[PDB]
Amino acid sequence: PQITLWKRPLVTIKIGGQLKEALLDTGADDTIIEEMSLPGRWKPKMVGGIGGFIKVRQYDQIIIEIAGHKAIGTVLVGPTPINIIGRNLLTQIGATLNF
Amino acid sequence: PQITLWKRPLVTIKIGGQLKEALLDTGADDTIIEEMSLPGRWKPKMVGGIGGFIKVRQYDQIIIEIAGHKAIGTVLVGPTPINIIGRNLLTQIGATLNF
Numbered sequence: 251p252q253i254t255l256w257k258r259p260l261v262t263i264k265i266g267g268q269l270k271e272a273l274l275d276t277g278a279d280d281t282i283i284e285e286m287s288l289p290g291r292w293k294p295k296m297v298g299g300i301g302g303f304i305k306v307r308q309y310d311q312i313i314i315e316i317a318g319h320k321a322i323g324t325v326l327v328g329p330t331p332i333n334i335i336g337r338n339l340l341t342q343i344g345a346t347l348n349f
Numbered sequence: 350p351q352i353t354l355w356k357r358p359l360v361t362i363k364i365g366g367q368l369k370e371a372l373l374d375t376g377a378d379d380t381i382i383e384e385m386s387l388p389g390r391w392k393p394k395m396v397g398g399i400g401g402f403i404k405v406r407q408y409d410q411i412i413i414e415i416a417g418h419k420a421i422g423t424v425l426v427g428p429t430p431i432n433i434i435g436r437n438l439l440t441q442i443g444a445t446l447n448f
């Protein structure tokens with residue numbers, strides 16, 4: 251699909267067996283999801299942007315489905331104000347910004 | 350162009366006759382630039398990012414070129430970690446997300 255930018259580019263994702271809405275964010279290096287359980291090992295990470303940093307749990311090799319496109323990658327979990335799909339998974343679904 | 354997301358989508362912008370680097374940021378409602386001088390009156394705005402909220406100065410109707418594309422619109426100035434071109438200007442330059 252072609253997603254204009256008149257409104258926030260929010261899509262449905264499926265992660266960890268759950269459906270969530272998330273923002274496709276070309277300004278995010280990483281994908282950050284609000285608190286939820288994920289399987290496997292995790293390590294702590296600090297990520298920052300406007301307003302400073304939050305601490306998250308980094309889970310690697312997590313499968314996600316973004317707007318019906320499957321991918322795998324690292325997912326950070328923590329107190330993000332909105333779920334964000336960042337470039338580490340946007341690449342995997344073949345997302346480009348075009349103008 | 351068609352910009353893939355394997356690296357940050359950084360572009361050159363021109364504002365106030367000066368070239369700067371900025372990030373094309375579909376996760377940003379607005380465009381925020383580091384401290385600089387812009388003409389005219391400003392209005393207060395609070396914006397929220399991953400880490401919390403910051404205060405910025407809102408300047409309207411500012412001439413700005415983004416990767417060679419001319420826009421005229423609102424630029425927030427304040428303590429952003431990096432200059433970000435948000436949706437208010439990405440729509441002016443005709444940018445979409447595509448996958």
Ligand SMILES: CCCC[C@H](CC(O)(O)[C@H](CCCC)NC(=O)[C@@H](NC(=O)[C@@H](NC(C)=O)[C@@H](C)O)[C@@H](C)CC)C(=O)N[C@@H](CCC(N)=O)C(=O)N[C@@H](CCCNC(=N)N)C(N)=O
Nearest residue numbers: 277278279280298299331376377378379396397398399430
């Ligand atoms: C949490 C809100 C959605 C996330 C986006 C994030 C982002 O703007 O894409 C910024 C790009 C700016 C780059 C620093 N990216 C980030 O903050 C991401 N940061 C990064 O990718 C890198 N960090 C740095 C400092 O570059 C990396 C080294 O970690 C983090 C998400 C972590 C991966 C964001 O902050 N959007 C703001 C931008 C400010 C603006 N345009 O006004 C927004 O639209 N805010 C809306 C409301 C959103 C709610 N926020 C909140 N705290 N409730 C608003 N204020 O009007």
